[PDB]
Amino acid sequence: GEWEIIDIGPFTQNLGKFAVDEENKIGKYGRLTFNKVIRPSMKKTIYENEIKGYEYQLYVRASDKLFRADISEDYKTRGRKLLRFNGPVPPP
């Protein structure tokens, strides 16, 4: 894979919302309220071994705490899945 910094525009915010919504269905943290994806946002390109998919790592502020969310995206299907949601974590 290769990692790159991505900006925190609407698409990235919408990934953050996705992570919180998914976590709220999962229920590990009870009910979270999405606030914002903060910098830095990172995106890993995963080759088939030719792009297979991507992994986003986002710092997501929800319920006034910070969480680290890792989201996978399948290049062909366009489907996304919440892989990890850790925290609360300290600020990057």
Numbering used by the authors: 1 to 49, 54 to 96
What did the paper state?
To circumvent this inconvenience, single chain derivatives with higher thermostability, among which MNEI, have been designed. All sweet proteins elicit a taste response upon interaction with the human taste receptor T1R2-T1R3, a heterodimeric G-protein coupled receptor (GPCR) located on specialised cells on the tongue.
The resulting constructs prepared for this study were therefore C41S, Y65R, S67K, D68N-MNEI (Mut1) and Q28K, C41S, Y65R-MNEI (Mut2). The other construct, Mut2 (Q28K,C41S,Y65R-MNEI), displayed instead amazing potency, with a recognition threshold of only 36 nM, roughly 30% lower than Y65R-MNEI and 3.5 times sweeter than the parent protein, according to literature data for MNEI34. On the contrary, in both molecules present in the a. u. of Mut2 and Mut3, S41 side chain adopts conformation 1 and forms a hydrogen bond with a water molecule that connects S41 to main chain atoms of residues P40, I38, Y63. In Mut2, containing the mutation Q28K, the lysine side chain is pushed away toward the solvent, forming a stabilising interaction with the hydroxyl group of Y47 from a symmetry related mate in one of the two molecules present in the a.u. and remaining disordered in the other one.
